[PDB]
Scaffold this active site. Sequence first.
Site, PDB file in Angstrom:
ATOM      1  N   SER A 693      -8.854  -3.085  -2.616  1.00  0.00           N
ATOM      2  CA  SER A 693      -9.334  -3.756  -3.852  1.00  0.00           C
ATOM      3  C   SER A 693     -10.419  -2.881  -4.499  1.00  0.00           C
ATOM      4  O   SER A 693     -10.105  -1.719  -4.805  1.00  0.00           O
ATOM      5  CB  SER A 693      -9.785  -5.171  -3.560  1.00  0.00           C
ATOM      6  OG  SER A 693      -9.741  -5.944  -4.747  1.00  0.00           O
ATOM      7  N   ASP A 771       1.516  -8.484  -5.719  1.00  0.00           N
ATOM      8  CA  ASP A 771       0.077  -8.772  -5.958  1.00  0.00           C
ATOM      9  C   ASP A 771      -0.085  -9.397  -7.349  1.00  0.00           C
ATOM     10  O   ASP A 771       0.225  -8.711  -8.345  1.00  0.00           O
ATOM     11  CB  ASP A 771      -0.754  -7.497  -5.794  1.00  0.00           C
ATOM     12  CG  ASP A 771      -2.246  -7.725  -5.610  1.00  0.00           C
ATOM     13  OD1 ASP A 771      -2.766  -8.731  -6.138  1.00  0.00           O
ATOM     14  OD2 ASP A 771      -2.878  -6.882  -4.945  1.00  0.00           O
ATOM     15  N   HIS A 803      -2.102  -9.717  -2.502  1.00  0.00           N
ATOM     16  CA  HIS A 803      -3.367  -8.931  -2.486  1.00  0.00           C
ATOM     17  C   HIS A 803      -3.797  -8.639  -1.043  1.00  0.00           C
ATOM     18  O   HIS A 803      -4.325  -7.536  -0.805  1.00  0.00           O
ATOM     19  CB  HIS A 803      -4.464  -9.656  -3.277  1.00  0.00           C
ATOM     20  CG  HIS A 803      -5.629  -8.784  -3.599  1.00  0.00           C
ATOM     21  ND1 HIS A 803      -5.486  -7.578  -4.260  1.00  0.00           N
ATOM     22  CD2 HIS A 803      -6.950  -8.931  -3.358  1.00  0.00           C
ATOM     23  CE1 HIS A 803      -6.667  -7.019  -4.413  1.00  0.00           C
ATOM     24  NE2 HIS A 803      -7.584  -7.831  -3.870  1.00  0.00           N
TER      25      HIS A 803
HETATM   26  B1  LIG Z   1     -10.697  -7.006  -4.867  1.00  0.00           B
HETATM   27  O1  LIG Z   1     -12.133  -6.507  -4.644  1.00  0.00           O
HETATM   28  O2  LIG Z   1     -10.391  -8.088  -3.823  1.00  0.00           O
HETATM   29  C1  LIG Z   1     -10.513  -7.553  -6.376  1.00  0.00           C
HETATM   30  C2  LIG Z   1     -10.898  -6.468  -7.377  1.00  0.00           C
HETATM   31  C3  LIG Z   1     -12.190  -6.897  -8.039  1.00  0.00           C
HETATM   32  C4  LIG Z   1     -12.488  -8.313  -7.571  1.00  0.00           C
HETATM   33  N1  LIG Z   1     -11.377  -8.691  -6.703  1.00  0.00           N
HETATM   34  C5  LIG Z   1     -11.065  -9.897  -6.222  1.00  0.00           C
HETATM   35  O3  LIG Z   1     -10.106 -10.041  -5.485  1.00  0.00           O
HETATM   36  C6  LIG Z   1     -11.847 -11.138  -6.591  1.00  0.00           C
HETATM   37  N2  LIG Z   1     -11.613 -11.501  -8.018  1.00  0.00           N
HETATM   38  C7  LIG Z   1     -13.355 -11.111  -6.299  1.00  0.00           C
HETATM   39  C8  LIG Z   1     -13.907 -12.537  -6.379  1.00  0.00           C
HETATM   40  C9  LIG Z   1     -13.714 -10.447  -4.968  1.00  0.00           C
END
Ligand SMILES: *[B]([O])([O])[C]1[C][C][C]N1C(=O)[C]([N])[C]([C])[C]
EC number: 3.4.14.5
Lengths: 836, 836
Positions: A693, A771, A803
Amino acid sequence: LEPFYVERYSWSQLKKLLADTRKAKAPHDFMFVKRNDPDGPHSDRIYYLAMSGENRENTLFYSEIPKTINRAAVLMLSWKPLLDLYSREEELLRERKRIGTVGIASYDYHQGSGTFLFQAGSGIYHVKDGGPQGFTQQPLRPNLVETSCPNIRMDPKLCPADPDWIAFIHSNDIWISNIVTREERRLTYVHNELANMEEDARSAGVATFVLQEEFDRYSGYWWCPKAETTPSGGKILRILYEENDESEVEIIHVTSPMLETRRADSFRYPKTGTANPKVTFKMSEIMIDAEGRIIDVIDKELIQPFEILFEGVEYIARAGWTPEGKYAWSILLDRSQTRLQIVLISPELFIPVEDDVMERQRLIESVPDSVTPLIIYEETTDIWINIHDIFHVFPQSHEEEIEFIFASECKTGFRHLYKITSILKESKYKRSSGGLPAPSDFKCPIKEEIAITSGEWEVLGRHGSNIQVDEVRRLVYFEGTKDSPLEHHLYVVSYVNPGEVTRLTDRGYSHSCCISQHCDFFISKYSNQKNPHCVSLYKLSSPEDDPTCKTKEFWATILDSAGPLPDYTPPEIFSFESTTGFTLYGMLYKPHDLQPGKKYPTVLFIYGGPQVQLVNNRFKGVKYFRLNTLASLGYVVVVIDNRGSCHRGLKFEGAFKYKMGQIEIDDQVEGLQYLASRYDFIDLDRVGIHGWSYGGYLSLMALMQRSDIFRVAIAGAPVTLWIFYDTGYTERYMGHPDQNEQGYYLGSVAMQAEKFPSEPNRLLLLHGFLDENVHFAHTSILLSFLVRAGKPYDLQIYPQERHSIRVPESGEHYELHLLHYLQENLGSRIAALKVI
Amino acid sequence: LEPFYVERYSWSQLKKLLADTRKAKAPHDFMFVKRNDPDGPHSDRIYYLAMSGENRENTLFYSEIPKTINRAAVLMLSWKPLLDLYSREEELLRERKRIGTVGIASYDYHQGSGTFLFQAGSGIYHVKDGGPQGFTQQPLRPNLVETSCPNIRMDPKLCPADPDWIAFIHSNDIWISNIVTREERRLTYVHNELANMEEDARSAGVATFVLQEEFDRYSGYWWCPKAETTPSGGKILRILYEENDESEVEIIHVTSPMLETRRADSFRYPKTGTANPKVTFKMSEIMIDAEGRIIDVIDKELIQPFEILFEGVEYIARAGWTPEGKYAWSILLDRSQTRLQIVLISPELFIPVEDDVMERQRLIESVPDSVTPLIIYEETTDIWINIHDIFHVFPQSHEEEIEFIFASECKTGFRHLYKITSILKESKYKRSSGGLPAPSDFKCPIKEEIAITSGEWEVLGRHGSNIQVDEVRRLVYFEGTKDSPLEHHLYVVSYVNPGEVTRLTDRGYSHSCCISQHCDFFISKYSNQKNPHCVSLYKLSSPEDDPTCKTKEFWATILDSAGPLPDYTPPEIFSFESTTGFTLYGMLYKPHDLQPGKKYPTVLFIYGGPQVQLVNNRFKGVKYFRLNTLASLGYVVVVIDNRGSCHRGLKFEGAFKYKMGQIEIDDQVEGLQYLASRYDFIDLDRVGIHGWSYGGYLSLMALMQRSDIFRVAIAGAPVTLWIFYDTGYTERYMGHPDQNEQGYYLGSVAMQAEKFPSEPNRLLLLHGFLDENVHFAHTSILLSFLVRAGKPYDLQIYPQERHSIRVPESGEHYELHLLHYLQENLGSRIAALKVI
Ligand SMILES: *[B]([O])([O])[C]1[C][C][C]N1C(=O)[C]([N])[C]([C])[C]
Ligand SMILES: *[B]([O])([O])[C]1[C][C][C]N1C(=O)[C]([N])[C]([C])[C]
Ligand code: NA
Ligand code: NA
């Protein structure tokens, strides 16, 4: 200094090594119920959700809390089973809530009757225990709530005013059901299940995507806690609910998990800089006769539009009712998420839905001009509002006043508890005069604002962290970082004359705590780097000379630690004074069986985004077990919390506002260079980076910005264009795209594909094909520009994954490929011979 | 024998080598027009489509054919420009037709008036030349056909009966337009452009996906060649058209090329074993007054349903009219594609469309029972019908007879020309009796069936190959493999007393030929392994003693060969007597600058599917230039035509019926083992395989079945599940899935993922992300099972590409990655050190 090369194993050998080294959720959602048995040996029964053991469903257990203990011995509370032995909307909720487990995820409880309500798969169930009908000594049979509804029922809630009534969502509409009479009734007619989602974009009582994913709000309706008695001997139950219209929200296609279909599912996804759903408040008024039959249901709307009564509000972050049900409350954000409001909403603001324009006007005039939205609290910040679950309203003492505890970073830059008293004045805006309200016509005057906590540390209000208020002793229990940003601890403080903050948890451990509603017990799930997680019960008591002072005493074990794993060496927490002016903390995994005069390949594992802290005093031998596996093969492993990470206050968090991707790798490299100066076994000519992510995003930024430092980057499900991500998250940290053209450009790796190396075996992209959070288009469009810029890449797809990685075969393939990729392109001797 | 290792270059160095070694469609669609100028020096003007040079649009040119030539010199005909200086449906047609070029793709011509009609981009244009109005000596201005239609107009055709009228398709409906009066008129109201494709699945005058992709039919409507005079001084123009209903056809989603949308487009795709479109014939009857204005249009349907009049027919393969317009004809297939019928369809079989059930019955009764479909020819085979473009109807001599030439493999197993005379008997089926027809009620008796050609060789009838009939001398010109399966040649034969077949083209070259309508000239595009393509004009003449005998004489050059490329070594055609009982042909690229006592890495390039022959005597220095590049770096390159490939007859083609994937690699390995026994420089311990489409499919089967032979397999856009491919292709070669459970299983690589190696750097998958032919799901589902079986893979995606590679940056990245992959995993020294 000789270069150490890792043993070069085959694909089959690494799979076997990973299988051999691979060869249970702790109790949670605790609730204390008093036995009230003077002659009996137990003061309380605790109920909780837990997995019976290694691999099984989550279910409800209870344990007995003795009035006295043998303080020589250690009491192990025995778990008693309370109970006798997925749809698309269930799958997506489990993604939004990050649930990895099966079975009961939560439960409702009415203390007056002892009625439990909970969803177990497709069924809604209820049992009774701890009420006036007493306490079971054996498992209870779950009573199925029968239904004529064809589709899955989601989000069941007990009516606090009457435990015969439950509400639930079915096809994005609110239903109610009486679990005694079996009357079933649809309250809202906003969605058609037969229609396509392109045609019907309306829902009631439901939290939409951005609020589940970015605000952790999963419900869109709230029972009024009290019933209004009628002159007939009946009553009125009320439900506040959010109504959503997603017509103007962009539709995107995500591949169906059924790959044989070769079809995609439609998803309402508010991408940054585009329309969020059109939202409003509604009230359902359920009239019930003396024997619990529904007489009629009146659906009611706001007297004036939402955009007029709540000027500038984009997001309903939180909502509920005051304790006596006099007002509904809501925490409201503007689009920039730099203005928070707590607004009280009277039921008198709602009039019946009426098409007859003659009767509609008669109803509008029947509502007094003194009935108005009451902004009891309003705050702003130049960084951002971090939404939390802390909001306590005291019982109404005076007529035109409200007393409440709230938490805020807006005053000092650190989250602290404040006791506030607001005057409920009559607004000088009068809607009969036929104008719009002025900016501050609904704002209430602050009679009193009292800081309860203060300092260079934060109160926690998310992920289960909240407060418990002792209204008798006038104390508030809370979790905080007061002793250290590496440990969470339980604290207590007076909210009358706030002063000394007493820590109730033992140092050397990070704690996650639940305090009994009766404020005489608390449970702690605690761990540290060396010791896996434990759960223990602690009795609270006051010294006879000072009821304000609180002491702790171990009472019993709930979950015993397995003890240090036989095949796990914990990392060392380190820190360094950064040139940025902050202490930055890190974790160092030294290579196992260090040989002297040899430098080892280094792997930097990274997240580095907001809302996460990787470095802290908790056990990492479960979720990050494979960092120990890398160290066991001769990799140095490093983790660093750069600026933007949490538990260090709003200034530290706000470092990358408008410039995500521009500062994180500076801190990561600074921490690497600090370590290599103190440790000569770190080979800086063989550094890899890996994250998922935001971690995969920064892994790409690392190779893009600093190919001088990083040999290989493995990026999982990375953000490559911030325009592709959603409103709630992206605009919070980066603002609107029009107001940050350079930040969005520099923060997007896909816009800078020509800055990647013209040298293979340095870039690996990993992505779940299904995803719906970080769309696969992030990877596909990055590949499009990499191909156009003549740049090489390696790619792995996980066709069955969203995800996260849930199917164990996908996880095994990911661990095997990554381990083999690090061997062949960083760690091994062949990896050195290959470099041109 | 020492192993030769290729020079190990960097990614940047291989890109430069490929750019340095990289640093025009020949004239086609020829037409001869007589000048009729006794005093003038030219007998004919030829018109043709060509690119003006290296990089430009295709446009119309003309050249002058002199009455006499200087037979000492070589005449170069000069090209005179005839003319003065994409939507989604255009993109998809270019994919179905495999068009790589821009500009005019085809043109229509009315000889009576000299009217050209052609589409150039979004415009339909017309010019006039060679008619009674004479011959231009300068470029003509294209006259735009003006329109009120908002969307792209496709498939414009001139009315042969009247060159003032054209037809075209707009939003899947038939329109007509008068290019003098500018009257514009919609004939069919079957589709709504505003509706979604899920709701409106009907079209008129259009060939659906399977017929464009698998039968090379691109039109769905045909003008009647003659007009019927009316008593008012007006006339009736007729259009036969196919009406399609795709409601029951499965919808699949293919990623939109606009990756920023994160959306997919809907596609009606008949996957094997599922519903093809519901098809019927319709006739539009256009009544026109004396001054060319439309009086009325009557849309007409078959008197009985299509399923009753044409029992068992799934596909309308071809259609048109008889020369005098008396009947419409159609070539009809059953679902198995083992039964072909040629059926004549009278306009009297069509009645006006009528909702009034009273009038409908009056019209049904007004049509005689003697009016019936006439099956003039019917054939069957136990292999499959190969559809072709050969069908010639002679002018009607007797009243109840039809004389025609057709081509067929069904008699001997080789495609040959047959002259057939059919008796048009009155059918004993009478629809007034109110029953269904018996199996053979519409079959016509064969008065005469005469084999014109015969032997172990085939007539060609696809890809432009057809016949020309001299009705005066009673000869037929055709292309065939009579001299060799490696060369196409022009032949002529009598169809009255067939005997000696005279070859008109010179041996040592493969030819593609166009014969003048006047049968006194022919053009040949000819090439061989050593010499790039030429285009020359040849004059035909008969000896004074025998008008049946035909001689050739070079007249003029149209396109001069560039000559042997300076940096290209052609391959050697080889052959071997296979244990299968067939001669199999191959191509061998020896490594450049052979050193003795050294064995070289070998790359096998493969297609190996039906409808293709890779090995033949043609120039390979354009399309397969990079096989010479592989040989220049020290790779042995091999190509082998296994059983199933074309130009060897139906038995050889039918070898893999029901068992695709099971026999091809046996032949490929047999050819490799033959070569290595005769040549010691072939290192059999370093063999790679690479192909696209069926080639990528067999590349996967090679690594799956024979990992003992093949080190590396690179598979482009491969078929991995035959259930995912379409009805027309898959059921032809493999039958219905229910009747071939084992063939579909064994033929599908994705069903056998556990048979791939547990050893990396052996499997590379390449795929265009937007592929609507071989869906990306073929790769994604193979990856799903490879991940589940713990198998390693490499993957490259081309996000901007469909089935072919069109964007040059994608082609450059593909060539660079493949060359670098062969170096690192097969050819180089590091590739040898890596093997565990
Ligand atoms: B990953 O960090 O899991 C992804 C990219 C930016 C934020 N995000 C998210 O899954 C969620 N929206 C946040 C709350 C961690
Ligand atoms: B590929 O060989 O181009 C693909 C897989 C099987 C057939 N096919 C096609 O593209 C076409 N349908 C045929 C006509 C070559
Ligand atoms: Na969430
Ligand atoms: Na085609």
